[PDB]
Tab-separated table of C-alpha atoms in Angstrom:
chain	number	residue	atom	x	y	z
A	1	UNK	CA	-96.184	83.936	85.639
A	2	UNK	CA	-94.887	87.283	84.393
A	3	UNK	CA	-95.670	89.858	87.108
A	4	UNK	CA	-95.267	92.652	84.557
A	5	UNK	CA	-98.183	91.347	82.464
A	6	UNK	CA	-100.440	92.536	85.299
A	7	UNK	CA	-100.086	95.949	83.670
A	8	UNK	CA	-102.467	94.622	81.015
A	9	UNK	CA	-104.787	92.254	82.919
A	10	UNK	CA	-108.485	93.102	82.463
A	11	UNK	CA	-109.692	95.301	85.308
A	12	UNK	CA	-106.247	96.503	86.348
A	13	UNK	CA	-106.202	100.220	87.177
A	14	UNK	CA	-103.152	102.412	86.642
A	15	UNK	CA	-102.487	105.426	88.873
A	16	UNK	CA	-102.191	108.733	87.010
A	17	UNK	CA	-100.300	111.626	88.582
A	18	UNK	CA	-101.727	114.950	87.381
A	19	UNK	CA	-99.656	118.117	87.901
A	20	UNK	CA	-100.901	121.518	86.699
A	21	UNK	CA	-98.782	124.582	85.915
A	22	UNK	CA	-99.941	128.168	85.358
A	23	UNK	CA	-97.201	130.105	83.591
A	24	UNK	CA	-94.692	127.430	84.593
A	25	UNK	CA	-95.684	127.467	88.257
A	26	UNK	CA	-97.025	124.283	89.852
A	27	UNK	CA	-100.444	125.073	91.332
A	28	UNK	CA	-101.999	121.636	91.666
A	29	UNK	CA	-101.273	117.918	91.906
A	30	UNK	CA	-103.473	114.882	92.390
A	31	UNK	CA	-103.041	111.173	91.689
A	32	UNK	CA	-106.094	109.292	90.445
A	33	UNK	CA	-107.144	105.774	89.464
A	34	UNK	CA	-110.323	105.035	87.501
A	35	UNK	CA	-111.303	102.424	84.885
A	36	UNK	CA	-112.669	105.201	82.671
A	37	UNK	CA	-109.602	107.369	83.215
A	38	UNK	CA	-109.750	111.075	84.018
A	39	UNK	CA	-111.036	114.437	82.787
A	40	UNK	CA	-109.345	117.776	83.346
A	41	UNK	CA	-112.185	120.207	84.137
A	42	UNK	CA	-112.407	123.859	85.119
A	43	UNK	CA	-115.759	123.696	86.900
A	44	UNK	CA	-117.224	121.176	89.336
A	45	UNK	CA	-120.829	122.116	88.551
A	46	UNK	CA	-121.065	119.389	85.923
A	47	UNK	CA	-118.396	117.244	87.551
A	48	UNK	CA	-119.446	113.581	87.372
A	49	UNK	CA	-122.042	113.708	84.595
A	50	UNK	CA	-119.646	112.030	82.141
A	51	UNK	CA	-117.472	108.929	82.601
A	52	UNK	CA	-113.986	109.428	84.006
A	53	UNK	CA	-112.714	110.956	87.243
A	54	UNK	CA	-112.951	114.781	87.139
A	55	UNK	CA	-109.771	116.641	88.109
A	56	UNK	CA	-110.589	120.329	88.694
A	57	UNK	CA	-107.880	122.860	87.816
A	58	UNK	CA	-107.734	125.676	90.453
A	59	UNK	CA	-108.723	129.313	90.089
A	60	UNK	CA	-105.510	131.275	89.387
A	61	UNK	CA	-106.455	133.920	91.939
A	62	UNK	CA	-104.954	131.669	94.606
A	63	UNK	CA	-101.501	131.367	93.046
A	64	UNK	CA	-100.584	134.298	90.811
A	65	UNK	CA	-100.840	138.091	90.643
A	66	UNK	CA	-100.226	138.890	86.972
A	67	UNK	CA	-103.663	140.059	85.841
A	68	UNK	CA	-102.971	139.421	82.160
A	69	UNK	CA	-102.092	135.778	82.743
A	70	UNK	CA	-104.919	135.446	85.277
A	71	UNK	CA	-107.433	136.547	82.640
A	72	UNK	CA	-106.165	134.022	80.101
A	73	UNK	CA	-106.240	131.109	82.561
A	74	UNK	CA	-109.801	132.005	83.591
A	75	UNK	CA	-110.803	132.003	79.921
A	76	UNK	CA	-109.345	128.503	79.638
A	77	UNK	CA	-111.186	127.235	82.714
A	78	UNK	CA	-114.213	128.653	80.920
A	79	UNK	CA	-113.856	126.672	77.652
A	80	UNK	CA	-112.937	123.377	79.354
A	81	UNK	CA	-116.537	122.128	79.581
A	82	UNK	CA	-116.675	118.331	79.635
A	83	UNK	CA	-112.888	118.537	79.786
A	84	UNK	CA	-109.772	116.884	78.392
A	85	UNK	CA	-110.366	113.141	78.702
A	86	UNK	CA	-107.497	110.653	79.061
A	87	UNK	CA	-107.898	106.893	79.552
A	88	UNK	CA	-106.345	103.508	78.866
A	89	UNK	CA	-107.574	100.560	76.802
A	90	UNK	CA	-105.107	97.695	76.624
A	91	UNK	CA	-101.611	98.934	75.756
A	92	UNK	CA	-102.890	102.310	74.526
A	93	UNK	CA	-103.543	105.648	76.206
A	94	UNK	CA	-106.259	107.673	74.444
A	95	UNK	CA	-107.232	111.334	74.702
A	96	UNK	CA	-110.229	113.320	73.516
A	97	UNK	CA	-111.119	116.977	73.969
A	98	UNK	CA	-114.780	117.039	75.015
A	99	UNK	CA	-115.075	120.758	75.698
A	100	UNK	CA	-114.314	123.906	73.706
A	101	UNK	CA	-110.610	124.545	74.397
A	102	UNK	CA	-108.120	123.749	71.625
A	103	UNK	CA	-105.784	121.371	73.473
A	104	UNK	CA	-102.373	120.125	72.297
A	105	UNK	CA	-100.245	117.227	73.514
A	106	UNK	CA	-96.685	115.958	73.560
A	107	UNK	CA	-94.792	113.051	75.093
A	108	UNK	CA	-91.722	114.423	76.846
A	109	UNK	CA	-89.457	114.376	79.901
A	110	UNK	CA	-90.762	115.202	83.371
A	111	UNK	CA	-89.666	118.830	82.915
A	112	UNK	CA	-92.109	121.340	81.441
A	113	UNK	CA	-91.192	121.298	77.732
A	114	UNK	CA	-90.217	124.603	76.166
A	115	UNK	CA	-91.655	125.760	72.845
A	116	UNK	CA	-89.220	123.720	70.763
A	117	UNK	CA	-90.862	123.102	67.405
A	118	UNK	CA	-94.460	122.483	68.448
A	119	UNK	CA	-96.541	119.767	70.181
A	120	UNK	CA	-96.898	116.206	68.882
A	121	UNK	CA	-100.425	117.118	67.786
A	122	UNK	CA	-103.821	118.533	68.724
A	123	UNK	CA	-106.196	116.365	70.764
A	124	UNK	CA	-109.264	115.591	68.587
A	125	UNK	CA	-112.861	116.156	69.642
A	126	UNK	CA	-114.887	114.200	67.072
A	127	UNK	CA	-113.077	110.977	67.952
A	128	UNK	CA	-110.496	109.475	70.296
A	129	UNK	CA	-106.836	110.064	69.602
A	130	UNK	CA	-103.967	107.773	70.527
A	131	UNK	CA	-101.327	109.568	72.593
A	132	UNK	CA	-99.129	106.766	73.943
A	133	UNK	CA	-98.396	103.127	73.103
A	134	UNK	CA	-96.855	100.905	75.777
A	135	UNK	CA	-95.389	98.599	73.143
A	136	UNK	CA	-92.631	100.873	71.745
A	137	UNK	CA	-92.046	102.202	75.266
A	138	UNK	CA	-91.161	98.728	76.571
A	139	UNK	CA	-88.989	98.018	73.507
A	140	UNK	CA	-87.107	101.262	74.157
A	141	UNK	CA	-86.869	100.403	77.873
A	142	UNK	CA	-85.222	97.088	76.953
A	143	UNK	CA	-82.779	99.002	74.720
A	144	UNK	CA	-82.043	101.298	77.685
A	145	UNK	CA	-81.096	98.326	79.902
A	146	UNK	CA	-78.623	97.379	77.159
A	147	UNK	CA	-76.895	100.756	77.319
A	148	UNK	CA	-77.392	101.405	73.599
A	149	UNK	CA	-80.461	103.549	74.196
A	150	UNK	CA	-81.473	106.346	76.544
A	151	UNK	CA	-84.307	106.510	79.074
A	152	UNK	CA	-87.710	106.258	77.305
A	153	UNK	CA	-90.167	109.122	77.846
A	154	UNK	CA	-93.520	108.519	79.578
A	155	UNK	CA	-94.718	112.014	80.525
A	156	UNK	CA	-97.753	113.347	78.689
A	157	UNK	CA	-98.045	117.125	78.506
A	158	UNK	CA	-101.327	118.844	77.634
A	159	UNK	CA	-101.278	122.522	76.669
A	160	UNK	CA	-104.778	123.990	77.071
A	161	UNK	CA	-105.689	127.065	75.051
A	162	UNK	CA	-108.851	129.086	74.425
A	163	UNK	CA	-111.782	128.195	72.164
A	164	UNK	CA	-110.515	130.835	69.707
A	165	UNK	CA	-109.016	129.203	66.573
A	166	UNK	CA	-106.344	131.917	66.237
A	167	UNK	CA	-104.880	131.316	69.701
A	168	UNK	CA	-101.406	129.711	69.611
A	169	UNK	CA	-101.075	128.403	73.205
A	170	UNK	CA	-97.967	126.293	72.665
A	171	UNK	CA	-95.867	129.427	72.291
A	172	UNK	CA	-96.269	130.690	75.857
A	173	UNK	CA	-97.662	127.468	77.336
A	174	UNK	CA	-99.544	129.390	80.045
A	175	UNK	CA	-101.703	126.391	80.995
A	176	UNK	CA	-99.790	123.081	81.113
A	177	UNK	CA	-100.910	119.805	82.680
A	178	UNK	CA	-98.541	116.859	82.998
A	179	UNK	CA	-99.969	113.374	83.336
A	180	UNK	CA	-97.611	110.632	84.424
A	181	UNK	CA	-98.705	106.971	84.547
A	182	UNK	CA	-96.714	106.164	87.702
A	183	UNK	CA	-96.166	102.543	86.697
A	184	UNK	CA	-94.020	103.781	83.791
A	185	UNK	CA	-91.952	106.136	85.961
A	186	UNK	CA	-91.324	103.129	88.241
A	187	UNK	CA	-90.319	100.845	85.361
A	188	UNK	CA	-87.703	103.384	84.260
A	189	UNK	CA	-86.435	103.791	87.842
A	190	UNK	CA	-86.243	100.013	88.266
A	191	UNK	CA	-84.093	99.878	85.129
A	192	UNK	CA	-81.941	102.889	86.051
A	193	UNK	CA	-81.300	101.800	89.645
A	194	UNK	CA	-81.269	98.030	89.185
A	195	UNK	CA	-78.943	98.260	86.194
A	196	UNK	CA	-76.152	99.922	88.168
A	197	UNK	CA	-76.262	97.576	91.181
A	198	UNK	CA	-75.787	93.845	91.804
A	199	UNK	CA	-78.254	94.031	94.690
A	200	UNK	CA	-81.861	92.918	94.184
A	201	UNK	CA	-84.046	96.012	93.636
A	202	UNK	CA	-87.707	96.502	94.540
A	203	UNK	CA	-90.392	97.951	92.263
A	204	UNK	CA	-93.835	99.346	93.027
A	205	UNK	CA	-95.858	99.402	89.801
A	206	UNK	CA	-98.507	101.542	91.479
A	207	UNK	CA	-101.393	99.600	89.969
A	208	UNK	CA	-104.469	98.100	91.660
A	209	UNK	CA	-104.251	94.989	93.843
A	210	UNK	CA	-100.476	94.732	93.538
A	211	UNK	CA	-97.503	94.776	95.907
A	212	UNK	CA	-93.939	95.909	95.223
A	213	UNK	CA	-91.710	93.288	93.608
A	214	UNK	CA	-88.068	92.475	94.298
A	215	UNK	CA	-86.207	91.355	91.195
A	216	UNK	CA	-82.650	90.886	90.008
A	217	UNK	CA	-81.558	92.684	86.841
A	218	UNK	CA	-81.633	89.443	84.830
A	219	UNK	CA	-85.163	88.602	86.002
A	220	UNK	CA	-86.471	92.071	85.184
A	221	UNK	CA	-84.935	91.891	81.710
A	222	UNK	CA	-86.421	88.448	81.036
A	223	UNK	CA	-89.817	89.752	82.135
A	224	UNK	CA	-89.616	92.792	79.853
A	225	UNK	CA	-88.795	90.455	76.942
A	226	UNK	CA	-91.821	88.275	77.623
A	227	UNK	CA	-94.044	91.325	78.225
A	228	UNK	CA	-93.399	92.312	74.589
A	229	UNK	CA	-95.234	89.129	73.521
A	230	UNK	CA	-98.235	90.499	75.393
A	231	UNK	CA	-98.627	93.499	73.081
A	232	UNK	CA	-99.397	94.322	69.442
A	233	UNK	CA	-96.703	95.558	67.051
A	234	UNK	CA	-97.811	96.413	63.515
A	235	UNK	CA	-95.749	94.870	60.715
A	236	UNK	CA	-94.466	96.934	57.742
A	237	UNK	CA	-96.861	95.238	55.386
A	238	UNK	CA	-99.843	94.732	57.699
A	239	UNK	CA	-103.463	95.956	57.763
B	1	UNK	CA	-92.153	123.489	120.986
B	2	UNK	CA	-90.155	122.151	118.014
B	3	UNK	CA	-91.507	118.598	117.527
B	4	UNK	CA	-88.507	117.595	115.415
B	5	UNK	CA	-86.153	118.111	118.373
B	6	UNK	CA	-87.772	114.976	119.835
B	7	UNK	CA	-85.297	113.114	117.625
B	8	UNK	CA	-82.647	114.199	120.105
B	9	UNK	CA	-84.404	114.078	123.486
B	10	UNK	CA	-82.583	112.059	126.165
B	11	UNK	CA	-83.843	108.487	126.185
B	12	UNK	CA	-85.496	108.762	122.784
B	13	UNK	CA	-85.348	105.602	120.657
B	14	UNK	CA	-85.127	105.487	116.861
B	15	UNK	CA	-86.374	102.524	114.812
B	16	UNK	CA	-83.727	100.923	112.577
B	17	UNK	CA	-84.711	98.876	109.538
B	18	UNK	CA	-82.193	96.083	109.014
B	19	UNK	CA	-82.108	94.341	105.607
B	20	UNK	CA	-79.536	91.630	104.776
B	21	UNK	CA	-78.488	90.380	101.332
B	22	UNK	CA	-76.520	87.255	100.366
B	23	UNK	CA	-75.040	87.286	96.876
B	24	UNK	CA	-77.277	90.285	96.154
B	25	UNK	CA	-80.459	88.471	97.222
B	26	UNK	CA	-82.576	89.710	100.153
B	27	UNK	CA	-82.706	87.054	102.858
B	28	UNK	CA	-83.739	88.901	105.999
B	29	UNK	CA	-85.470	92.037	107.246
B	30	UNK	CA	-86.318	93.335	110.678
B	31	UNK	CA	-86.915	96.693	112.323
B	32	UNK	CA	-85.632	97.198	115.853
B	33	UNK	CA	-85.501	99.779	118.651
B	34	UNK	CA	-83.148	99.732	121.643
B	35	UNK	CA	-81.330	102.452	123.575
B	36	UNK	CA	-78.042	100.534	123.214
B	37	UNK	CA	-78.438	100.115	119.479
B	38	UNK	CA	-78.131	96.780	117.697
B	39	UNK	CA	-75.605	94.024	116.995
B	40	UNK	CA	-75.500	91.954	113.800
B	41	UNK	CA	-74.501	88.421	114.808
B	42	UNK	CA	-74.276	84.945	113.289
B	43	UNK	CA	-75.151	82.894	116.371
B	44	UNK	CA	-77.682	83.145	119.191
B	45	UNK	CA	-75.464	81.442	121.768
B	46	UNK	CA	-73.724	84.709	122.624
B	47	UNK	CA	-76.455	87.298	122.086
B	48	UNK	CA	-77.632	89.061	125.242
B	49	UNK	CA	-74.187	88.942	126.856
B	50	UNK	CA	-73.325	92.425	125.623
B	51	UNK	CA	-75.522	95.533	125.327
B	52	UNK	CA	-77.377	96.130	122.081
B	53	UNK	CA	-80.188	94.130	120.516
B	54	UNK	CA	-78.864	91.037	118.690
B	55	UNK	CA	-79.970	90.731	115.070
B	56	UNK	CA	-79.239	87.185	113.880
B	57	UNK	CA	-78.325	86.799	110.197
B	58	UNK	CA	-79.911	83.613	108.721
B	59	UNK	CA	-78.305	80.370	107.579
B	60	UNK	CA	-77.738	80.705	103.810
B	61	UNK	CA	-78.887	77.110	103.508
B	62	UNK	CA	-82.509	78.161	103.122
B	63	UNK	CA	-81.913	80.739	100.379
B	64	UNK	CA	-78.770	79.820	98.430
B	65	UNK	CA	-77.729	76.866	96.270
B	66	UNK	CA	-74.216	77.732	95.094
B	67	UNK	CA	-71.879	75.790	97.387
B	68	UNK	CA	-69.059	78.252	96.823
B	69	UNK	CA	-71.103	81.203	98.059
B	70	UNK	CA	-72.749	79.290	100.924
B	71	UNK	CA	-69.341	78.283	102.282
B	72	UNK	CA	-68.145	81.883	102.275
B	73	UNK	CA	-71.291	83.181	103.999
B	74	UNK	CA	-71.099	80.520	106.714
B	75	UNK	CA	-67.502	81.542	107.364
B	76	UNK	CA	-68.641	85.147	107.741
B	77	UNK	CA	-71.360	84.111	110.154
B	78	UNK	CA	-68.545	82.346	112.037
B	79	UNK	CA	-66.311	85.442	112.519
B	80	UNK	CA	-69.146	87.765	113.565
B	81	UNK	CA	-68.782	86.825	117.237
B	82	UNK	CA	-69.898	89.749	119.401
B	83	UNK	CA	-71.164	91.248	116.159
B	84	UNK	CA	-71.213	94.525	114.263
B	85	UNK	CA	-72.479	97.113	116.748
B	86	UNK	CA	-74.400	100.209	115.645
B	87	UNK	CA	-75.966	102.700	118.062
B	88	UNK	CA	-76.882	106.349	118.496
B	89	UNK	CA	-75.458	108.942	120.899
B	90	UNK	CA	-77.007	112.363	120.371
B	91	UNK	CA	-76.721	113.385	116.706
B	92	UNK	CA	-74.190	110.671	115.836
B	93	UNK	CA	-74.538	107.075	114.732
B	94	UNK	CA	-71.587	104.994	115.956
B	95	UNK	CA	-70.344	101.573	114.865
B	96	UNK	CA	-67.769	99.168	116.282
B	97	UNK	CA	-66.759	95.684	115.122
B	98	UNK	CA	-66.731	93.475	118.232
B	99	UNK	CA	-66.040	90.198	116.446
B	100	UNK	CA	-63.442	89.028	113.951
B	101	UNK	CA	-64.951	89.832	110.531
B	102	UNK	CA	-63.398	92.777	108.698
B	103	UNK	CA	-66.377	95.055	108.085
B	104	UNK	CA	-66.578	98.044	105.761
B	105	UNK	CA	-69.219	100.757	105.623
B	106	UNK	CA	-70.654	103.430	103.361
B	107	UNK	CA	-73.543	105.886	103.431
B	108	UNK	CA	-75.401	105.620	100.099
B	109	UNK	CA	-78.827	105.311	98.380
B	110	UNK	CA	-81.610	102.868	99.322
B	111	UNK	CA	-79.776	100.574	96.878
B	112	UNK	CA	-75.959	100.501	96.945
B	113	UNK	CA	-74.580	101.216	93.428
B	114	UNK	CA	-71.684	99.174	92.010
B	115	UNK	CA	-68.483	101.169	91.516
B	116	UNK	CA	-64.700	101.121	91.357
B	117	UNK	CA	-64.812	103.130	94.573
B	118	UNK	CA	-63.864	101.751	97.964
B	119	UNK	CA	-65.997	101.965	101.127
B	120	UNK	CA	-66.212	105.114	103.231
B	121	UNK	CA	-63.900	103.170	105.536
B	122	UNK	CA	-63.539	100.110	107.774
B	123	UNK	CA	-65.460	99.799	111.046
B	124	UNK	CA	-62.856	99.900	113.861
B	125	UNK	CA	-62.680	97.347	116.684
B	126	UNK	CA	-60.333	99.039	119.176
B	127	UNK	CA	-62.744	101.948	119.562
B	128	UNK	CA	-66.075	103.335	118.353
B	129	UNK	CA	-66.163	104.892	114.887
B	130	UNK	CA	-68.569	107.559	113.650
B	131	UNK	CA	-70.576	106.467	110.612
B	132	UNK	CA	-73.328	109.075	110.380
B	133	UNK	CA	-73.877	112.660	111.532
B	134	UNK	CA	-77.412	114.051	111.668
B	135	UNK	CA	-76.075	117.616	111.613
B	136	UNK	CA	-74.843	117.729	107.976
B	137	UNK	CA	-77.833	115.599	106.998
B	138	UNK	CA	-80.360	118.199	108.141
B	139	UNK	CA	-78.355	121.043	106.605
B	140	UNK	CA	-78.267	119.197	103.283
B	141	UNK	CA	-81.954	118.375	103.764
B	142	UNK	CA	-82.746	122.076	104.088
B	143	UNK	CA	-80.664	122.827	100.983
B	144	UNK	CA	-82.792	120.171	99.274
B	145	UNK	CA	-86.116	121.796	100.199
B	146	UNK	CA	-84.687	124.936	98.591
B	147	UNK	CA	-83.890	123.103	95.364
B	148	UNK	CA	-80.280	124.179	95.850
B	149	UNK	CA	-79.116	120.607	96.367
B	150	UNK	CA	-79.754	116.903	95.873
B	151	UNK	CA	-81.681	114.675	98.284
B	152	UNK	CA	-79.395	113.799	101.253
B	153	UNK	CA	-78.443	110.135	101.733
B	154	UNK	CA	-79.374	108.207	104.898
B	155	UNK	CA	-78.828	104.514	104.145
B	156	UNK	CA	-75.936	102.771	105.891
B	157	UNK	CA	-74.380	99.801	104.125
B	158	UNK	CA	-72.152	97.313	105.896
B	159	UNK	CA	-70.081	94.824	103.903
B	160	UNK	CA	-69.063	91.896	106.121
B	161	UNK	CA	-66.043	89.819	105.143
B	162	UNK	CA	-64.048	86.987	106.702
B	163	UNK	CA	-61.387	87.368	109.404
B	164	UNK	CA	-58.606	86.811	106.840
B	165	UNK	CA	-56.718	90.052	106.126
B	166	UNK	CA	-56.294	89.099	102.451
B	167	UNK	CA	-60.050	88.948	101.877
B	168	UNK	CA	-61.410	91.803	99.709
B	169	UNK	CA	-65.165	91.504	100.437
B	170	UNK	CA	-65.943	94.953	99.041
B	171	UNK	CA	-65.325	93.527	95.574
B	172	UNK	CA	-67.911	90.743	95.378
B	173	UNK	CA	-70.128	92.073	98.190
B	174	UNK	CA	-71.527	88.639	99.076
B	175	UNK	CA	-72.736	89.672	102.532
B	176	UNK	CA	-74.294	93.124	102.676
B	177	UNK	CA	-76.494	94.611	105.359
B	178	UNK	CA	-78.480	97.803	104.944
B	179	UNK	CA	-79.474	99.805	107.996
B	180	UNK	CA	-81.957	102.632	107.638
B	181	UNK	CA	-83.049	104.947	110.456
B	182	UNK	CA	-86.647	105.218	109.268
B	183	UNK	CA	-87.021	108.687	110.747
B	184	UNK	CA	-84.544	109.913	108.132
B	185	UNK	CA	-86.357	108.152	105.291
B	186	UNK	CA	-89.534	109.879	106.493
B	187	UNK	CA	-87.896	113.314	106.731
B	188	UNK	CA	-86.628	113.125	103.132
B	189	UNK	CA	-89.991	112.120	101.751
B	190	UNK	CA	-91.662	114.950	103.687
B	191	UNK	CA	-89.327	117.329	101.865
B	192	UNK	CA	-90.541	115.815	98.576
B	193	UNK	CA	-94.279	115.563	99.227
B	194	UNK	CA	-94.434	118.943	100.940
B	195	UNK	CA	-93.662	120.475	97.568
B	196	UNK	CA	-96.791	118.911	96.054
B	197	UNK	CA	-99.263	120.760	98.284
B	198	UNK	CA	-98.735	123.701	100.655
B	199	UNK	CA	-101.475	122.266	102.881
B	200	UNK	CA	-101.111	119.819	105.774
B	201	UNK	CA	-98.805	116.810	105.482
B	202	UNK	CA	-98.188	113.894	107.828
B	203	UNK	CA	-94.683	112.834	108.794
B	204	UNK	CA	-94.157	109.749	110.947
B	205	UNK	CA	-90.745	109.966	112.638
B	206	UNK	CA	-90.892	106.336	113.742
B	207	UNK	CA	-89.361	107.111	117.141
B	208	UNK	CA	-90.540	106.144	120.639
B	209	UNK	CA	-93.143	108.057	122.658
B	210	UNK	CA	-94.209	110.232	119.731
B	211	UNK	CA	-97.262	110.647	117.482
B	212	UNK	CA	-97.098	111.266	113.715
B	213	UNK	CA	-96.867	114.991	112.931
B	214	UNK	CA	-99.121	117.151	110.761
B	215	UNK	CA	-97.215	120.045	109.213
B	216	UNK	CA	-97.139	122.434	106.282
B	217	UNK	CA	-94.069	122.989	104.121
B	218	UNK	CA	-93.533	126.376	105.766
B	219	UNK	CA	-93.708	124.881	109.269
B	220	UNK	CA	-91.508	121.912	108.373
B	221	UNK	CA	-88.884	124.234	106.910
B	222	UNK	CA	-88.958	126.460	109.997
B	223	UNK	CA	-88.578	123.459	112.292
B	224	UNK	CA	-85.668	122.171	110.207
B	225	UNK	CA	-84.061	125.599	110.569
B	226	UNK	CA	-84.438	125.457	114.346
B	227	UNK	CA	-83.426	121.803	114.607
B	228	UNK	CA	-79.994	122.850	113.320
B	229	UNK	CA	-79.454	124.859	116.522
B	230	UNK	CA	-79.825	121.646	118.509
B	231	UNK	CA	-76.724	120.105	116.944
B	232	UNK	CA	-72.968	120.739	116.786
B	233	UNK	CA	-71.145	121.813	113.623
B	234	UNK	CA	-67.366	122.117	113.867
B	235	UNK	CA	-66.157	125.554	112.836
B	236	UNK	CA	-63.181	126.254	110.543
B	237	UNK	CA	-60.038	125.915	112.648
B	238	UNK	CA	-61.933	124.863	115.773
B	239	UNK	CA	-60.702	122.255	118.265
């Protein structure tokens, strides 16, 4: 009876908002839904040959003037190949770099992350790599509704560099693509808005075959608690 | 020429979305249009006796269980009389309390936040009282499209209490009614979506005798700039 468990029902499709930035400037945005997820590509020639919805990054000639940056971005569109794949399987979001560009990822806020101290890791090519687990996110969301914890992050940032092994793209972050599972942005909003008001709030999970839901703060909290029973959490001493 | 000025053409009719809440729970929703505005009432025996479209608030019997709360709400429905009147005249939204219930108002978010703050004021009965001015809204809206300001608020909240002067309804907020001029909700979103793609965007003003509009961010911004000239803004030290 938990409406939130729909997030994990077999066949449910999440909506992914993709926003691209060249040198920190937004040059593209598209929201997609696909069972096999999506693939960030630079060319449409070999668009739908592989599984996953192809999202084509635009030629920089239509957004910037800096020739030095323009050259780099075109080199990146060139190594993309099959592309950066991102998809969901259960409570996990997986990524895999199918082309030739060294691509790095990080979970962060909705703002383009600055250099800081590096990305969370490099997206693997030989095998899939886990980049987000809904379990800990929901646990942290529950903690947020209790005031003892801040708003949990849900934005995935992918820094795409060249095929060259020496290139250190995270430093300048010239090609950045944010992917936001809109259901997670909504869950945080529901918590942020609903928690500060006694009035019933409405939530749109932005998932397939679903309608917005009006819930009181106590109902939402009880549903988050039960949703936790719908996911895996590894024990300290468990294999 | 400027399609947005249709919002102010003589005879034009805006659509108002009315949503009522009892003890924080949504119990009614209706969208209405009428040149003489609307009137929130508790009985249908004295509806169409005064100008304004009567919007009847429902018996709490088919939504509430707490006897304490139900008694209070029924008392409120009993003082409404002529009702809470809300209507538009040019760029202003006016309200007047024709019945006996002390009624307080506030312009806020789509969901009214709880706070130690009082209402923006009490709706007067002796005369009409201004509750919303499109002028400042549009100016703030423009500031918003420039990233130099937050998204302007457009949701009107009316807290309806009993006739008793001692009653402090704004504290428990048992009977709340939200009124949203959907054209304003649409204008704010346009300012948000327009920033996602410089191309064409559709904005439905939800007003009479008018088709949805197809505009670009540049056109929308220019029309907002010109719309300002169609409204009054009191100058410093002006009568």
